[PDB]
């Protein structure tokens, strides 16, 4: 009891080194598009045509 | 009209675009320089004498009197039109851009 009167709590946790996330990032196909001017026209005062 | 023009969009995505080749075009050149990863037809031996007669004349296409040459590459066609797509889409794609 009278030593505890200067003592107070280190932080000490243990991981894993390496944490994988709970679902891992997937491959996204390549679709082939052609040159679209016309999808900034909703960012903005845009103009159509 | 500067109004109907819409500079602006033309070029911030015209910028993208040209990143995007440039990257697809880095990755294929990239795919085709170590003889590793290049597609087989380009390193086959007896594909050899098709791919150097083509390139002898790029320009031209003479699939009519081929003098039994290109017999090999005339029954896996379908194999070539499923592995050589995606550069030559690539290429297209470069040239509209």
């Not at chain 2, 003889?35 to 597609?39: F, H, N, T």
């Given at each position: 009891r009278e030593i505890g009167i200067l003592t107070t709590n280190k932080n000490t946790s243990r991981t894993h080194k390496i944490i994988a996330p709970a679902n891992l990032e997937r491959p996204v196909r390549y679709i082939r598009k052609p040159i679209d001017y016309t999808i900034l026209d909703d960012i903005g005062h845009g103009v159509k045509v | 009209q500067p109004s109907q023009q819409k500079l602006a969009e033309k070029l911030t995505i015209l910028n993208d675009r040209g990143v995007g080749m440039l990257t697809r075009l880095y990755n294929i050149k990239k795919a085709c320089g170590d003889?590793?990863?290049?597609?087989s037809y380009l390193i086959d031996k007896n594909l050899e004498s098709a791919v150097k007669f083509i390139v002898r004349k790029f320009p031209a296409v003479e699939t009519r009197n081929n003098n039994q040459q290109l017999a090999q590459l005339q029954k896996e066609k379908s194999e070539i039109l499923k592995n050589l797509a995606l550069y030559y889409f690539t290429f297209v794609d470069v040239m509209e851009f």
């Open positions: - | 003889p590793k990863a290049k597609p």
